């Protein structure tokens, strides 16, 4: 499969030897629903730590490209947009990480979910790290399952910065997040605020309130992970222009019309599986301005956002709306 290109006209208007190097974390979320975010009007405070952080924009109208990890994750990094995106040929397309890497941005992908679903396949494999096992993830024995935790993807990031001193960096952290059906496994005891909690894999058999409690508890652990990611970025804010993008890959059905989990084809998927949260945070010194919080946005906004974050322009997406101006 030879590579089909889309942005080899891309140019970086300023280089990190002539201005401040830029360091961005893009959290690729998992199964998070927009309508269970407190900032979007949910009845529960599911993001208490993200709330205390100044400079975070919550986007209340974001629609995902699809309803599954294999479908949406390549669409998120693609140049084609949702209405031309072909999941079966995405692996052979130049994607936005191929462009930024070719332009010299240091690309790191850490995965506590599954893998990059083909996004990183053209880059050297040393740039992808499996964080689902203790060989990389130092934070696994904090729960009765010894499930490795998303926050463990932040450990050792300082040594990655040290190895790329004075370069632009884009760090993708692929979250386990709210992956089901075992939502009760996805968070440590610290986040068991909502009880009782469904523990069965047979979601339709659980009490509904119990199912929601486990789901919302998992969101509390993602709140903690995003906050810690911003806090890590703040420790490098003097030498680097730092920012954090979070977007979920899709939402989740939680019993509506007897539908559970996700992956329903777009042609008849419910609203709940495509309505996703998005958050953007930047340091005041970066000069990045977020779009209005109620901008109508989709996964198509991600690729132009990453390019803008590193001062890159490509004809392919020059008219496209991003999360930032």
Q: Return binding residues.
A: 30, 69, 249-250
Q: How far is the CB of 250 from Zn ion (least distance, A)?
A: 5
Minimum distance, C-beta of residue 155 to Zn ion, in the bound complex (Å): 24
Exposed (0-12), middle (13-18) or buried (19+): which is 70, by Cβ within 10 Å? Answer: middle
Q: How far is the CB of 30 from Zn ion (least distance, A)?
A: 5
- Part of the chain binding Zn ion (CB under 5 A), chosen from 61-69, 103-111, 201-209, 286-294: 61-69
Residue 249 as a binder of Zn ion (CB under 5 A): the answer is: yes
**Contact with Zn ion (CB under 5 A) among 69, 95, 106, 137:** 69
- Among residues 103, 155, 147, 167, the alpha carbon closest in space to that of 129 is found at 155
Choose between 232 and 279: whose C-beta lies nearer to Zn ion.
Answer: 279
Residues across the chain: 325
- Starting at the earlier edge strand, list the strands of the sheet with 278-282: 56-59, 278-282, 241-248, 22-29, 169-174, 106-111, 128-130
Q: Taking CB under 5 A as the rule, does residue 150 contact Zn ion?
A: no
β-pair partners for 70: none
| Piece of 42-50, 66-74, 144-152, 220-228 that binds Zn ion (CB under 5 A) | 66-74
Number of residues that bind Zn ion (CB under 5 A): 3
Looking at beta carbons only, is 23 or 75 nearer to Zn ion? Answer: 75
- Tell me if 111 contacts Zn ion by CB under 5 A: no
Tally of CA atoms within 13 A in the half-sphere of 123 that contains its CB: 24
Tokens coding 100:
């930024």
Cis geometry, peptide bond prior to residue 181 (ω within 30 degrees of 0): yes
Q: Residues with Cβ < 8 Å from 269, sequence gap 6 or more?
A: 67
User: Considering beta carbons, is residue 30 or 101 the nearer one to Zn ion?
Assistant: 30
The residue with its CB nearest to Zn ion is: 69
Those residues whose C-beta lies under 8 Å from the C-beta of residue 17, and which sit 6 or more positions away, are: 166
CA distance 35 to 79: 28
Q: How far is the CB of 79 from Zn ion (least distance, A)?
A: 21
Residues 19-38 that bind Zn ion (CB under 5 A): 30
Per the annotation, binding residues for Zn(2+) are 30, 69, 249-250
Q: Which is nearer to Zn ion, 15 or 271 (CB)?
A: 271
What CA–CA distances, in Å, run from 17 to 12, 30, 301? 12, 36, 28
Q: How far is the CB of 187 from Zn ion (least distance, A)?
A: 17
β-sheet bridge partners, residue 211: none
For residues 101 and 252, which CB has a smaller minimum distance to Zn ion in the complex? Answer: 252
Q: Pick the piece of the chain touching Zn ion (CB under 5 A) from 50-58, 151-159, 243-251, 290-298.
A: 243-251
Binding residues (CB under 5 A) for Zn ion: these are 30, 69, 249
């Amino acid at each position: 499969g030879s590579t089909i290109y889309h942005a080899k006209d891309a140019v970086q208007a300023t280089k990190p030897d002539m201005r401040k190097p830029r360091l961005v974390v893009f959290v690729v979320g998992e199964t998070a629903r927009a309508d269970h975010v407190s900032f979007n009007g949910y009845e529960r405070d599911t993001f208490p730590q993200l709330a205390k952080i100044d400079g975070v924009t919550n986007f209340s109208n974001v629609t995902s490209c699809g309803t599954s990890t294999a479908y949406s994750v390549p669409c998120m990094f693609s140049y084609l947009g949702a209405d031309e995106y072909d999941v079966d040929t995405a692996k052979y397309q130049e994607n936005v990480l191929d462009t930024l890497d070719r332009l010299g941005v240091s690309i790191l992908w850490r995965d506590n979910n599954s893998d990059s679903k083909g996004v990183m396949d053209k880059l050297p494999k040393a740039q992808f790290a499996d964080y689902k096992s203790a060989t990389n993830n130092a934070i696994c024995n904090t729960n009765p399952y010894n499930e490795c935790r998303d926050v463990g993807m932040l450990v050792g990031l300082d040594d990655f910065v040290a190895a790329n001193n004075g370069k632009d960096m884009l760090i993708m952290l692929h979250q386990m997040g709210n992956h089901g059906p075992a939502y009760f496994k996805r968070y440590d005891e610290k986040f068991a605020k909502f009880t009782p909690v469904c523990e069965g894999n047979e979601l339709a058999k659980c009490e509904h309130q119990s199912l929601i409690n486990a789901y919302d508890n998992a969101l509390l652990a993602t709140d903690d992970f995003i906050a810690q990611s911003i806090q890590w970025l703040q420790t490098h804010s003097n030498a680097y222009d730092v920012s954090m993008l979070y977007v979920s890959d899709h939402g989740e059905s939680l019993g509506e019309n007897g539908v559970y989990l996700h992956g329903m084809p777009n042609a008849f998927a419910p609203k709940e599986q495509r309505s996703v949260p998005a958050f953007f945070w930047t340091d005041k010194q970066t000069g990045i301005t977020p779009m209005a919080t109620d901008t109508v946005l989709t996964h198509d906004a991600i690729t132009p956002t990453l390019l803008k974050l590193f001062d890159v322009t490509a004809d392919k997406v020059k008219d496209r709306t991003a999360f930032i101006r």
